[PDB]
Amino acid sequence: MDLYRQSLEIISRYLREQATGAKSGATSRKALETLRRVGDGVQRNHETAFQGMLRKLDIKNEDDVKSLSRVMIHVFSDGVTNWGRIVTLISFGAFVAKHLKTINQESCIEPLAESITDVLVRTKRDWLVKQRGWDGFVEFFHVE
Amino acid sequence: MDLYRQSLEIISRYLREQATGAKSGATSRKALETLRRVGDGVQRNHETAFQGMLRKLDIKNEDDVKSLSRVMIHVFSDGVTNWGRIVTLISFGAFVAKHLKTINQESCIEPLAESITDVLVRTKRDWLVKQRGWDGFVEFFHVE
Numbered sequence: 178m179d180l181y182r183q184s185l186e187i188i189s190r191y192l193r194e195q196a197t198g199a200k201s202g203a204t205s206r207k208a209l210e211t212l213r214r215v216g217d218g219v220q221r222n223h224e225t226a227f228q229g230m231l232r233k234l235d236i237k238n239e240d241d242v243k244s245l246s247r248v249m250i251h252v253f254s255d256g257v258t259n260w261g262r263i264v265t266l267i268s269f270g271a272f273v274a275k276h277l278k279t280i281n282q283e284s285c286i287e288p289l290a291e292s293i294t295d296v297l298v299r300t301k302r303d304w305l306v307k308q309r310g311w312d313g314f315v316e317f318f319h320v321e
Numbered sequence: 322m323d324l325y326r327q328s329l330e331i332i333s334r335y336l337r338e339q340a341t342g343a344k345s346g347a348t349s350r351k352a353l354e355t356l357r358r359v360g361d362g363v364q365r366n367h368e369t370a371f372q373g374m375l376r377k378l379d380i381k382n383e384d385d386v387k388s389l390s391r392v393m394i395h396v397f398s399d400g401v402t403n404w405g406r407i408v409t410l411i412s413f414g415a416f417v418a419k420h421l422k423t424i425n426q427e428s429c430i431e432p433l434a435e436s437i438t439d440v441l442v443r444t445k446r447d448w449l450v451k452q453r454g455w456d457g458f459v460e461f462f463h464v465e
């Protein structure tokens with residue numbers, strides 16, 4: 178609750194808007210705004226690595242989308258955590274959501290956002306709380 | 322020349338006097354006078370935002386002072402330009418100069434003023450010329 182629900186609201190709004198191309202109070206609005214700026218940047222600056230990762234995952238059916246969590250928890254959870262990696266996790270989610278629309282699996286975009294939220298909140302809860310959650314995310318990307 | 326040299330004279334005089342506490346003809350005198358009034362106001366009214374920005378920059382050595390230009394060009398150059406932002410750029414310079422004196426880096430105050438001048442004149446030359454330079458700055462802040 179609260180941190181999970183807020184995270185689910187931000188990630189699912191961002192994935193939905195990235196796929197379609199269309200568009201806790203102020204924190205969620207600010208988080209979406211920062212995520213649109215930084216997230217879109219990451220996707221442009223790492224299109225090559227994101228395309229190569231997308232090819233290795235080879236998404237054809239809805240069983241392929243459900244199998245993403247297995248790679249996701251291990252890859253994301255390994256190493257040191259920082260806001261840069263959280264953005265990469267979410268931006269690659271938006272990149273996968275765009276290809277889901279392309280292959281007529283648009284309905285598996287909301288469960289994808291929920292899978293991303295499970296990996297983020299269930300592996301990094303303590304770090305997120307100490308970093309002031311989504312408010313900490315907004316001020317970390319405030320300047321530049 | 323002229324616009325650059327005049328800008329360097331005003332900014333360096335203002336940063337030097339703010340740090341120490343002591344004190345083109347009439348235009349430069351008037352500009353300094355307007356900058357003392359408006360600049361000191363900005364520093365008092367935005368002490369919280371200036372302290373938070375100063376903490377994020379974390380200035381300990383002279384390599385930290387030289388690295389300021391990187392953040393400065395991007396932050397200043399983004400968005401719409403107006404005299405309010407130019408004052409903010411210079412007032413924050415005066416705020417940084419005060420802390421430089423506190424940490425025995427008083428000699429890196431003149432190169433700081435020159436770095437600020439480079440960002441201002443090399444990114445906003447055309448706008449400054451059309452706004453009548455420092456004369457336009459003086460009549461913009463004449464009333465109130």
Ligand SMILES: CC(=O)N1CCN(c2ccc(OCc3nn(C)c(C)c3-c3cccc4c(CCCOc5cccc6ccccc56)c(C(=O)O)n(Cc5cccnc5)c34)cc2)CC1
Pocket residue numbers: 219223226227230245248249252253260261262264265266267269270273293
């Ligand atoms: C401002 C600021 O602070 N910054 C600084 C840093 N900057 C930045 C930005 C990108 C950078 O690399 C992208 C990259 N390059 N390559 C070669 C690969 C394979 C990737 C790469 C590609 C895709 C995701 C990641 C993730 C997410 C977890 C897995 O997510 C999923 C896994 C599987 C399925 C998923 C489905 C949905 C959602 C997430 C999924 C990571 C990671 O965990 O870091 N990587 C890196 C990495 C991973 C493994 C080995 N090697 C490197 C990724 C480096 C720096 C961003 C902005």
Ligand SMILES: CC(=O)N1CCN(c2ccc(OCc3nn(C)c(C)c3-c3cccc4c(CCCOc5cccc6ccccc56)c(C(=O)O)n(Cc5cccnc5)c34)cc2)CC1
Pocket residue numbers: 319320321359363367370371374389392393396397404405406408409410411413414417437
């Ligand atoms: C007279 C009149 O008409 N007015 C109307 C406007 N008024 C006013 C006044 C201040 C206001 O906000 C201050 C503020 N708040 N916060 C949260 C932050 C982080 C700041 C803030 C703090 C520090 C500078 C700026 C700059 C300068 C460029 C970068 O300078 C440097 C960057 C780095 C190193 C440097 C070193 C030496 C010199 C300049 C440097 C800007 C900018 O570009 O505007 N900001 C704003 C801003 C920037 C980014 C995100 N968010 C907001 C700044 C709002 C309204 C004054 C009176």
Ligand SMILES: [Zn+2]
Pocket residue numbers: 219222223
């Ligand atoms: Zn990058």
Ligand SMILES: [Zn+2]
Pocket residue numbers: 240
């Ligand atoms: Zn099956």
Ligand SMILES: [Zn+2]
Pocket residue numbers: 235237240241
């Ligand atoms: Zn398969």
Ligand SMILES: [Zn+2]
Pocket residue numbers: 251
């Ligand atoms: Zn594993």
Ligand SMILES: [Zn+2]
Pocket residue numbers: 251255
């Ligand atoms: Zn491992």
Ligand SMILES: [Zn+2]
Pocket residue numbers: 319
């Ligand atoms: Zn701001």
Ligand SMILES: [Zn+2]
Pocket residue numbers: 363366367
């Ligand atoms: Zn103000």
Ligand SMILES: [Zn+2]
Pocket residue numbers: 321395
């Ligand atoms: Zn930049």
Ligand SMILES: [Zn+2]
Pocket residue numbers: 321395399
């Ligand atoms: Zn920018």
